[PDB]
Amino acid sequence: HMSDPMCLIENFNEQLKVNQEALEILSAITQPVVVVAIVGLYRTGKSYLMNKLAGKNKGFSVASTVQSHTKGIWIWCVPHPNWPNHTLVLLDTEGLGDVEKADNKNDIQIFALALLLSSTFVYNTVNKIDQGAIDLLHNVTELTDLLPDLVWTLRDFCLGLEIDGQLVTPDEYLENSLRPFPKKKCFIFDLPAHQKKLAQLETLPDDELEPEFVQQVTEFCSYIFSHSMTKTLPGGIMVNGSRLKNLVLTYVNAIS
Amino acid sequence: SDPMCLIENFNEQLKVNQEALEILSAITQPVVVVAIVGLYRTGKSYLMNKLAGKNKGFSVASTVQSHTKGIWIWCVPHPNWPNHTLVLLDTEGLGDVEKADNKNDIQIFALALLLSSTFVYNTVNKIDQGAIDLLHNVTELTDLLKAPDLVWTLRDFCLGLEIDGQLVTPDEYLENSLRPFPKKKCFIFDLPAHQKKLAQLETLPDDELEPEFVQQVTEFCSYIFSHSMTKTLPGGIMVNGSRLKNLVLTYVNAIS
Ligand SMILES: Nc1nc2c(ncn2[C@@H]2O[C@H](COP(=O)(O)OP(=O)(O)O)[C@@H](O)[C@H]2O)c(=O)[nH]1
Ligand SMILES: Nc1nc2c(ncn2[C@@H]2O[C@H](COP(=O)(O)OP(=O)(O)O)[C@@H](O)[C@H]2O)c(=O)[nH]1
Ligand SMILES: [Mg+2]
Numbered sequence: 045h046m047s048d049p050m051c052l053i054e055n056f057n058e059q060l061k062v063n064q065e066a067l068e069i070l071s072a073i074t075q076p077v078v079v080v081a082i083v084g085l086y087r088t089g090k091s092y093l094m095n096k097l098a099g100k101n102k103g104f105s106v107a108s109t110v111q112s113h114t115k116g117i118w119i120w121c122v123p124h125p126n127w128p129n130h131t132l133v134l135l136d137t138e139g140l141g142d143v144e145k146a147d148n149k150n151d152i153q154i155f156a157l158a159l160l161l162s163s164t165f166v167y168n169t170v171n172k173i174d175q176g177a178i179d180l181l182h183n184v185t186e187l188t189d190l191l192p193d194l195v196w197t198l199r200d201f202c203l204g205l206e207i208d209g210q211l212v213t214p215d216e217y218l219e220n221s222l223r224p225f226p227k228k229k230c231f232i233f234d235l236p237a238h239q240k241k242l243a244q245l246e247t248l249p250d251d252e253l254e255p256e257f258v259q260q261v262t263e264f265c266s267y268i269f270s271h272s273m274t275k276t277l278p279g280g281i282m283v284n285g286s287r288l289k290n291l292v293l294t295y296v297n298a299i300s
Numbered sequence: 301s302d303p304m305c306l307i308e309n310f311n312e313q314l315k316v317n318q319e320a321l322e323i324l325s326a327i328t329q330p331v332v333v334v335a336i337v338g339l340y341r342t343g344k345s346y347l348m349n350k351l352a353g354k355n356k357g358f359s360v361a362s363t364v365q366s367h368t369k370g371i372w373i374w375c376v377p378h379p380n381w382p383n384h385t386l387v388l389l390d391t392e393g394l395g396d397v398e399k400a401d402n403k404n405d406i407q408i409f410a411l412a413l414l415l416s417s418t419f420v421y422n423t424v425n426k427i428d429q430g431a432i433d434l435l436h437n438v439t440e441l442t443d444l445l446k447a448p449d450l451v452w453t454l455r456d457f458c459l460g461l462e463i464d465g466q467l468v469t470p471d472e473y474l475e476n477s478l479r480p481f482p483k484k485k486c487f488i489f490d491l492p493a494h495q496k497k498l499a500q501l502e503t504l505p506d507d508e509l510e511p512e513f514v515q516q517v518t519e520f521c522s523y524i525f526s527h528s529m530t531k532t533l534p535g536g537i538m539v540n541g542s543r544l545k546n547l548v549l550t551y552v553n554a555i556s
């Protein structure tokens with residue numbers, strides 16, 4: 045359908061306001077939708093990875109400075125690569141913890157909204173699983189209840205996957221980290237390239253990336269394309285683009 | 301000659317180690333106390349050994365699990381300031397997912413802060429708002445428990461230092477990030493090894509490390525050696541080893 049993404053939810057001075065042009069594109073989708081949203085700290089490769097789910101080299105804009113780039117929530121509606129009569133809806137979002145914004149409540153509001161619209165929720169962190177990232181995920185989850193399948197991605201991962209002398213998979217690392225989201229999954233990613241090639245990463249063909257990184261991305265994408273389910277609402281109703289439009293309006297209005 | 305544990309943390313019970321207290325009380329020279337704090341698995345222990353001018357000291361280790369526990373102390377001669385002892389504090393990193401005791405983290409944070417005359421705050425990739433909020437929270441809390449130079453170290457730094465179209469020094473990046481610790485400084489460090497051969501980093505010589513990283517560590521160390529001052533109590537009272545020991549006892553109680 046769409047050749048580029050567009051802003052679904054604007055955030056100019058921290059006001060969550062829907063964008064009509066994107067809303068109108070949503071309601072013209074009568075197919076069931078798979079909604080994959082991405083959330084994590086800012087400057088963390090989120091936009092760059094989501095473009096991989098689209099199969100295109102560019103899409104959500106990625107930038108290379110210390111300053112945040114993505115604002116609000118962005119949407120890309122494309123045919124599901126495996127699944128006939130299904131549309132893949134990608135939600136790319138403004139990273140949390142931007143020091144120039146310094147507005148945790150706006151952060152929490154963007155988080156909650158991406159978590160409410162998604163059927164697959166991609167939580168993007170760097171190096172390792174941090175307790176603060178778990179606590180934030182938990183707290184937004186509790187707020188989201190009072191008003192999806194978890195894919196925890198670990199970027200620039202090099203620590204030994206080793207707990208008390210035993211080699212573990214990322215999935216077992218994630219499981220070990222959450223002991224005292226029914227469907228959970230955890231994907232690791234190497235440093236995509238050497239550090240001085242990182243700013244131009246978008247323009248680099250697979251040839252010039254870390255070979256393992258390329259396979260880890262294909263692994264991440266294949267899992268999504270073949271396990272991420274149609275967005276579902278209580279009462280065995282299946283969400284199409286029109287119903288997702290209503291949820292966007294419902295949730296935006298309830299948050300503000 | 302080798303660091304020893306100052307504050308033990310078995311079962312998240314903070315307790316003083318009498319052997320380290322007794323070494324401190326025999327130091328009559330003024331002390332320059334440098335403490336490092338950051339999230340776990342962030343190369344704190346590795347960096348602190350650079351200040352000691354010894355390739356080995358504080359133990360590092362390379363798996364997803366936390367390694368350093370409690371607070372370790374290492375009293376070494378100041379490299380260029382006669383009759384001054386450089387007291388290095390290496391701390392258990394924050395946010396360890398196996399710990400399930402957020403209160404214990406904050407107490408280690410407060411203790412390191414209360415004892416330091418130079419406080420090194422070690423973060424990865426970027427300054428993020430959660431790290432500032434945590435610094436502010438703990439700084440506010442230590443002023444109650446009392447009823448210091450800040451050096452922000454940015455590890456694995458690749459983002460462009462450019463804000464609103466203008467190049468920034470690390471100092472300016474810190475200042476822009478903190479804009480709504482009287483003395484403040486900031487330092488960037490490249491990825492040290494241009495191969496994620498990071499797990500054996502402690503064994504490599506400088507010629508196999510990233511050269512920019514070697515030069516960045518030297519500048520960090522030079523600043524600590526030239527700018528860090530003797531720990532000072534209110535009233536211009538200058539802290540020697542014997543006085544620092546009683547500081548440790550006072551604050552361990554105030555934190556309990
Ligand atoms: N270290 C690292 N950098 C990345 C990765 N993916 C992308 N980048 C670079 O990180 C910078 C910010 O990426 P971006 O997609 O804008 O991150 P976002 O702010 O989280 O959406 C860009 O210069 C990217 O080229 C990764 O996996 N690791
Ligand atoms: N990526 C990266 N790894 C590092 C750096 N410094 C040390 N390491 C590696 O990171 C791991 C953790 O080091 P350690 O000092 O024990 O981390 P700590 O828990 O913060 O004390 C070890 O494998 C080190 O070899 C760095 O600047 N960048
Ligand atoms: Mg982005």
Ligand SMILES: [Mg+2]
Nearest residue numbers: 344345368391
């Ligand atoms: Mg350590």
